[PDB]
Amino acid sequence: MYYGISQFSEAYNKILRNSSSHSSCQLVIFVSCLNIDALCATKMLSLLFKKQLVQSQIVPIFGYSELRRHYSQLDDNINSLLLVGFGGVIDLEAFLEIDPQEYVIDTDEKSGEQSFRRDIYVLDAHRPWNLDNIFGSQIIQCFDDGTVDDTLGEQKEAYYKLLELQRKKQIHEYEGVLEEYYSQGTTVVNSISAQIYSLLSAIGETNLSNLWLNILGTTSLDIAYAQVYNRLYPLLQDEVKRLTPSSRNSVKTPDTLTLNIQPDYYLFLLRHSSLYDSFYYSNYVNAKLSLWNENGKKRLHKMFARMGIPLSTAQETWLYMDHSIKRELGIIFDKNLDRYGLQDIIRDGFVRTLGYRGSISASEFVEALTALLEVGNSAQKLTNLRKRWVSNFWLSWDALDDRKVELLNRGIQLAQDLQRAIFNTGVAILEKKLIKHLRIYRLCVLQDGPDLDLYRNPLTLLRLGNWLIECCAESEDKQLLPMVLASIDENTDTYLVAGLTPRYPRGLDTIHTKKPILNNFSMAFQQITAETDAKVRIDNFESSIIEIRREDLSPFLEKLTLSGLL
Amino acid sequence: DDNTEIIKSFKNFILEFRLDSQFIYRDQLRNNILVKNYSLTVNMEHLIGYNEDIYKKLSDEPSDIIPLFETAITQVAKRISILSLPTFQLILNSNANQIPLRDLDSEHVSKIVRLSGIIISTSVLSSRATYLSIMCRNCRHTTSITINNFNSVSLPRSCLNCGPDPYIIIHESSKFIDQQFLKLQEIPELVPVGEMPRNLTMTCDRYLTNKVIPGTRVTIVGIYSIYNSVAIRTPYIKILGIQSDVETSSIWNSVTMFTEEEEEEFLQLSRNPKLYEILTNSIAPSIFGNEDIKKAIVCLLMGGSKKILPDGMRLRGDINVLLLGDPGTAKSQLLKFVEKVSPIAVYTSGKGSSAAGLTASVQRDPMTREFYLEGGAMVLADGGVVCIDEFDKMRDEDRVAIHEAMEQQTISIAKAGITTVLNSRTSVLAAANPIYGRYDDLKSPGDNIDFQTTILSRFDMIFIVKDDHNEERDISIANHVINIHTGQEENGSEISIEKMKRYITYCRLKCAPRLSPQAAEKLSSNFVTIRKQLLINEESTERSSIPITIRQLEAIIRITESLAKLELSPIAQERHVDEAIRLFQASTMDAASQ
Amino acid sequence: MSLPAHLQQTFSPEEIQFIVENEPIKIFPRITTRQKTRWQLITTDDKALNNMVAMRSTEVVLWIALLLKQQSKCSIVAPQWLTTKELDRKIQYEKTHPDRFSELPWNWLVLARILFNKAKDDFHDPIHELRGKIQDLREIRQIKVLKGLKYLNESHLQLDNLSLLEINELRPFITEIMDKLREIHTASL
Amino acid sequence: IYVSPQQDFSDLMKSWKNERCSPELLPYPHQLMKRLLNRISMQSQLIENISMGNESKLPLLCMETELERLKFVIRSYIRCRLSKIDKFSLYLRQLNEDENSLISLTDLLSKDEIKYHDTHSLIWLKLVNDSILKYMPEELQAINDTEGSVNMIDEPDWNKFVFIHVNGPPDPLLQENEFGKPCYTVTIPDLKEEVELTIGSIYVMRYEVIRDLLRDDKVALI
Ligand SMILES: Nc1ncnc2c1ncn2[C@@H]1O[C@H](COP(=O)(O)OP(=O)(O)OP(=O)(O)O)[C@@H](O)[C@H]1O
Ligand SMILES: [Mg+2]
Ligand SMILES: [Zn+2]
């Protein structure tokens, strides 16, 4: 079964009723280890449960195998289980070997319903929903954002008729529509933090900290799924307007907290680095100027000279930069960015300030959190690496608190270093012309780089993939093509293949740009793995990221090219 | 008018700032007043955060705004300390981009700038005027003047008939402060192409004096001003804050400066069961092998203990190491690393050195026509290590000037009417090549070493490094170098340069171990055995070029004491004696036997 | 042995806080416990809690008040002495009399910290002003303490109106110095 | 004289503070401690009975927190008493060995304290006898010799300086001063002084002179 948008309050009340007893804890939350949106949603849930004095346990998780292990290790006193950030696409009942009969408590013939000791709640933004979890199972409860009622009526009817059952033709039509539904790729439709904030608004527990966490969760998706961010932006604007005090005439105090909608820019850590660095290490600026060669640097220098900012002034840190230029920056950009094609740098973002402290924007906060998640600090080595990532999750969690600002500064520095390393790797990739072009898709394989170790983490590989996608591919007027990025680690002798969906030119509203692009790589990878024999791993939550043995990549890519299902 | 408002704004900033629940500057001022430290250190980021207008005012006209800030600080201090005190000093800290010393020009006149350099000279403290009492010659009119040390003041030209300049200062009623002059050079790596390093004149006041010693890299925050010594002005820097990576206060004083959190980090590190391996691996990580030489360098850095007997006799406590080997042994790289890591060190070339360069030089002042003594590498590197590269290239005359420095740790000067005995407590790490550039086994050791025995006896450990062509070692070294070229453990197997330097300083200032009776007995037995072996090894044709005297016994004792000091152990046991004996056998007896 | 060395002869700040939280305080209940289960406490009185009505002044123990406040079931009524006007009057009294201490409550510092950390929206006056006033009072009292420390002797000593936290802070130094002076005087005889 | 649980808790807190700040080992409140332990047992049983059986969630939390606070207070008091007994074992033994002394450890200590004292004394004596004492001559084989160069029995510091707060009777000893406020008068024999203690005033007195007032409960150690 699934809960509509208005049933969030009922689900929360059910959780309170069942998993609430000061004698012992009965609530466990499973969280995706490498998702910022899930991190913020779990932080909001943790604060909400702390308010009501609900005993709970929070367990970071990486991959489906660890989910199976931890679920098997769960005690019998867990009345409710929360799956935050995953589980939507897979069959939890079949995957977790959950048999409803062994989970029932009491059955009433008159009521026609059965009570179960354990309950599972799924907070997943990915699509398509697995119809087994939505329409078939009763133990699995899914927090739907309305998609099922909006567009899944026909699939609902088909699945119900399949369950209810010359008849061969009808069964064929129903199974055909079901297969057609299942044949689509996977994308993200909404932010889980938005749903948690909707629940809080329903029960009236919304404040400024919750709004900040919601903003962070929503903006985490801006880099990849800009359509979702554009759809959710007006609500964030309205909520910030509602929660902000009407009068701002009072002078700043040490405890004052500000949350303004100020003009933000598509620049990398503008407020914690130099303007030159902000323009240099930005994906959009590099894409529109090709800063990976000398011509791009010359163009950037010419742009800075025409804006009237001396090179020495530009390289000065943000805090100590000349105040006149800092104040005029908006006008200067208004008049000069259009010449070089950087008209999209102008944007409106959310900036949070604390009394007598520096001001940090939402994008910079998300960047710091992601940097802490990434570089914060056979099967045995893999387990140790995943344990290290689980540990980094808690550094990222701590950074979300206002008392732990040193962690945020460390994360900012690590983000700067990581962006520098990714820029160097991208320069190496593009100069060598390593991006082979096949008709079906692009291919790029890393074998002897200088910083190969950094790319064992899926998040860093995704960062590099986004950098490469925006640069020389989003531009050049080249037909959109999915990209394959692979890296190699000598300590284990295996690959980390990651499929990436193409992106339309940024900030180009169009009917075709309005339509989304689905990620079909999961289906093709699964089909190839099932047909072939290469001992591939699809344990990662992001089904597009797999681990491949050193020898099998060439046959795997041959089969991928011959499949034509990308 | 405006000055009062500026003072009020600064007072409000001092009395209102807070980042969580502690008034940082209020409490800091109270604590400083408690210990008679009339100053206040302000972080400019906090000032920017509190109010950007105040920072703009401070940056626009520092020379006119800073005195108002000092007055505000004094008023707040009087409010906080006295229940109804000279003018307080303002020390600034900033993280702005450092301007290269050579990039300072007209554009930076009368502005706050941050730069780093090397201090090459310091002056004797002078006396400045803050409160002057004056009296007129004719009518005897008492008057007072208050002077700030920031220059964009003079005795009145007209009395308050009296002639021009009628006021005479009454000294016994005036108040003065301390002043010092420093010479700052630019970092060698930052010098432009084919240019001599540039010097800059700087001044410090009150609590910023006696903070730096010559030869130490520092970071300076100050005002780039000018003074008229006709259409030109001599540039200079008015120091507002000094930041250095070496605790100079703890070096020239028996007092030691280390935070409680530091002291407890260095104790935990010392508690490590295998600190010796960590330090051995932490020296020259980019050099393959040479483990024994790395251990010798560790011992030299740690040093031994010095004893002053009741009769006045003094025993040396510094360890000297010589490296005689073939080309490509990486001796010069080891010397450079030693110079980089030691708290105090000077890297000098034997070729490019002189007798007067390396000890002290009689210099005549151009103006006073009086002779003074400047200092050389062995006075500038007092309390540290002197890396004398190309030891063999040094002339005899030059060389001979080093003996007393090495052994007696003093410099005796009798020149131009100057009779003094300077102090040079240094350790000498020298590298040299044989006579023919390689150690030819066909010829006797005496023919391969031109060094007289007198100089060699002073070196505690002598390493004769010979390059042997072994395929396995050659392949290993090639792989290591290739990995270096094409290419951070920090997992307890190695500590960075800064931590090692701080630990060296702490160990030197904290521990001075002593030998146990068993160690003394074992050492005497080993010394007798070594001397007997040397006597046996003698051949009628020639006498041993490598000597074994009482100095070698003292050197072994020093090595044992340094090994004990490494672990902060107050006593040296047989465990350290064994390692010292092994090192001596591996280096000095190895050189002598050949 | 059984008791650590730092807990010997003195109280730790946590112990002082624990002592403070035993005192009463006034609250505004946001629920109606009174009838028209039941608290059964053995250390304090349970009559007040049972006879609690909404938006009606009642007196309970400070720790119980904080526990209720955590659940947002009661608004803590700040002490009368913790107003800006009263703090200003106390500062004036301190300034006018350099020889004595103002008659502040014996738990003013601890209670102020507890209320600032736990009950921030209950105060009628801005929090920063109260923090500044408390800081100024603390510095004035520190000056007075430093001035009065010069009269340590082998005989008694009087420190009237000094709060509990200040006495706890000063106990080691004062006690040891006076003990040594007494020992010297006794040896002299 | 039992009054109510609140008075028992107040007396327990007063005893804890006095024991923490007192130099000597004060007499054990046997009846009060027995009442407190019995009340703790009954309250724990009541809490268990209620728990075994949402408006009732907060009261239970309050009961549990109160029980924890009371347990902590009793624990700290008893541990301080045990430490003091450790520091004065020989003193206590000397007290018991004397018959003319009025005090007896049965009144001055509880049964658990007596058992702990005896066991610890025996264990430490065995250790020091097997280690050191068995080698010394008969003249030096006594762990507690008062005729030696340095006395081995560590008595309490009678004249230790402590902080006090004068509260007055919950009074023949009470008298008024010139300024019309009630006051107490105590003497310091060594200095031949007279000190006037004013009710409601904090002082730093010697323990010996204020011992009687503290025992009578006219003053309380801060
Ligand atoms: N074991 C080693 N590991 C790494 N680099 C090495 C090693 N041995 C030699 N080298 C390199 O060989 C070069 C030798 O130059 P270097 O000045 O260090 O030699 P040297 O031993 O002082 O000889 P010379 O007597 O000719 O001055 C340096 O680049 C050093 O880095
Ligand atoms: Mg060389
Ligand atoms: Zn005159």
CSV table of all heavy atoms in Angstrom, one decimal, chain B residues 331-333 347 389-390 431, ligand 2:
chain,number,residue,atom,x,y,z
B,331,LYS,N,74.1,12.8,-0.7
B,331,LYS,CA,74.5,13.5,0.5
B,331,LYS,C,74.0,14.9,0.5
B,331,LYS,O,73.6,15.4,1.6
B,331,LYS,CB,76.1,13.5,0.5
B,331,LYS,CG,76.7,12.1,0.3
B,331,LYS,CD,78.2,12.1,0.6
B,331,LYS,CE,79.0,12.9,-0.4
B,331,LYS,NZ,78.9,12.3,-1.8
B,332,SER,N,74.1,15.7,-0.6
B,332,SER,CA,73.7,17.1,-0.6
B,332,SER,C,72.2,17.2,-0.3
B,332,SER,O,71.7,18.1,0.4
B,332,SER,CB,74.0,17.7,-1.9
B,332,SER,OG,74.0,19.1,-1.8
B,333,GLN,N,71.4,16.2,-0.8
B,333,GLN,CA,69.9,16.3,-0.6
B,333,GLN,C,69.7,16.0,0.9
B,333,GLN,O,68.8,16.7,1.5
B,333,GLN,CB,69.2,15.2,-1.4
B,333,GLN,CG,69.3,15.4,-2.9
B,333,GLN,CD,68.4,16.5,-3.4
B,333,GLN,OE1,68.1,17.5,-2.7
B,333,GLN,NE2,67.8,16.3,-4.6
B,347,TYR,N,72.7,26.5,5.7
B,347,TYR,CA,73.4,25.7,4.7
B,347,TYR,C,74.4,26.6,4.0
B,347,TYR,O,74.1,27.6,3.4
B,347,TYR,CB,72.3,25.2,3.7
B,347,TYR,CG,72.9,24.4,2.5
B,347,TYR,CD1,73.1,23.1,2.6
B,347,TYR,CD2,73.2,25.0,1.3
B,347,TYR,CE1,73.7,22.4,1.6
B,347,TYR,CE2,73.7,24.3,0.3
B,347,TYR,CZ,74.0,23.0,0.4
B,347,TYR,OH,74.5,22.3,-0.6
B,389,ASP,N,78.4,21.9,3.0
B,389,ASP,CA,78.6,21.1,1.8
B,389,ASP,C,79.9,21.3,1.2
B,389,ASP,O,80.5,22.4,1.3
B,389,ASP,CB,77.4,21.4,0.9
B,389,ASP,CG,77.1,20.2,0.0
B,389,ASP,OD1,77.7,19.1,0.1
B,389,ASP,OD2,76.2,20.3,-0.9
B,390,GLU,N,80.4,20.4,0.4
B,390,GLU,CA,81.6,20.5,-0.3
B,390,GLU,C,82.7,20.8,0.6
B,390,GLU,O,83.5,21.7,0.4
B,390,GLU,CB,81.5,21.5,-1.4
B,390,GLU,CG,80.5,21.3,-2.4
B,390,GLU,CD,80.6,20.2,-3.4
B,390,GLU,OE1,81.5,19.3,-3.1
B,390,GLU,OE2,80.0,20.2,-4.5
B,431,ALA,N,79.7,17.1,4.1
B,431,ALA,CA,79.8,16.2,3.0
B,431,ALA,C,81.0,16.5,2.2
B,431,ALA,O,81.3,17.7,2.0
B,431,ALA,CB,78.5,16.2,2.2
E,2,MG,MG,76.9,17.4,-3.3
